């Protein structure tokens, strides 16, 4: 499924993403905004043979297990599977654990070169919440 | 499935190092985040550390960078180094993975002359 | 660092009824709160991840609910080897705290 802005904005805060790690709301929703355009189906495969899933393009070498990826880690402890799920539960929870590493957002190439340093609150503003 | 382990000494003088290894068995040292957290006599829980899988740590600022979280790949272990220990340091001391569905059995450290 | 109260210290109970365990936040921490079982000084055990999420192999008359700086973790149906300290810990923010813990003592 393709999420609304406000749409994504009020289920990362249901799912406890506001300052996680530091990271304001507005971060998360425009890293999914470059990263995925909101469409928790979206997938792309990489040169080195892994693929990165879902709404925050989390990659199969690291942080799920697919089951095709070479020096493949499963980090998060789940399927890439779970991550293409209409219900985004699976993706936070990775992208927490994800986050939690001494890299903190710089794990989104997508969030360093499109949100890092922006007014990233403009991506939160008319969803009251 | 994965199965953690504490050793190492359960004497430590004041003043001086607490050294402790976790031994993981049923994946790798790459494949999670790994933490320390101790237990005082009176039910008291502590967050102490863990490292995660870039080689980044995080330390309680509670422990005054009195602590040392390392890992050795080929062994699959890793480490606590805990120095300048006083009996404010006797403590019951667990590792566990970041997630938490994993933990050792925990093992009691006392600190004496 | 977060502060996380637990209410109340303790709480015996009849088996097959039910308890509410209490645990408020010195400040919001969305849903990043989990609940742990432990045994004396054995190892801790998770019940609950972020604030109400399963964990397979916990029974289901363990729930939590709760967001921003109240939560609650029910267990209905008490059994014998409920026994124990109840912990809730804030993964909010490093660095990562718990609760001074819940005592459930079993009425027989």
């Known amino acids: 499924k393709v999420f609304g802005r406000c749409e994504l904005a009020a289920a990362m805060k249901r799912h406890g993403l506001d300052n996680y790690q530091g990271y304001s709301l507005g971060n998360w929703v425009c890293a999914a905004k470059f990263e995925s355009n909101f469409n928790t189906q979206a997938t792309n495969r990489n040169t080195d043979g892994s693929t990165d899933y879902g709404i925050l393009q989390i990659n199969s070498r690291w942080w799920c297990n697919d089951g095709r990826t070479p020096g493949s880690e499963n980090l998060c402890n789940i399927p890439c599977s779970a991550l293409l799920s209409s219900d985004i539960t699976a993706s936070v929870n990775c992208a927490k654990k994800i986050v939690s590493d001494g890299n903190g957002m710089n794990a989104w190439v997508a969030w360093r070169n499109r949100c890092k340093g922006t007014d990233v609150q403009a991506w939160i503003r008319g969803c009251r919440l | 499935d994965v199965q953690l382990q504490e050793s190492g000494p359960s004497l430590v003088k004041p003043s001086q190092t607490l050294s402790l290894t976790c031994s993981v068995t049923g994946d790798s040292i790459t494949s999670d985040y790994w933490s320390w957290i101790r237990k005082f006599p009176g039910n008291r829980l502590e967050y102490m550390g863990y490292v995660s899988y870039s080689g980044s740590t995080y330390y309680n600022p509670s422990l005054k960078s009195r602590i040392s979280i390392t890992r050795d790949t080929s062994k699959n272990q890793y480490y606590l180094d805990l120095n300048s220990v006083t009996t404010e340091d006797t403590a019951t001391y667990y590792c566990?993975?970041?997630?938490?569905?994993?933990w050792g059995q925990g093992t009691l450290v006392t600190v004496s002359a | 660092d977060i502060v996380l109260t637990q209410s109340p210290a303790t709480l015996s109970v009849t088996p097959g009824n039910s308890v509410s365990l209490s645990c408020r936040a010195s400040?919001?921490?969305?849903?990043?709160l989990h609940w742990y079982q432990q045994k004396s000084h054995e190892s801790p055990r998770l019940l609950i991840k972020?604030?109400?999420q399963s964990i397979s192999g916990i029974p289901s008359r363990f729930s939590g609910s709760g967001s921003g700086t109240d939560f609650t973790l029910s267990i209905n149906s008490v059994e014998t080897e409920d026994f124990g300290m109840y912990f809730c810990q804030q993964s909010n923010s490093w660095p990562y705290t718990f609760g001074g813990g819940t005592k459930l003592e079993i009425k027989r």
């Open positions: 972020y604030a109400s």
């Open positions: 400040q919001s921490i969305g849903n990043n």
């Open positions: 566990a993975n970041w997630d938490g569905d994993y």
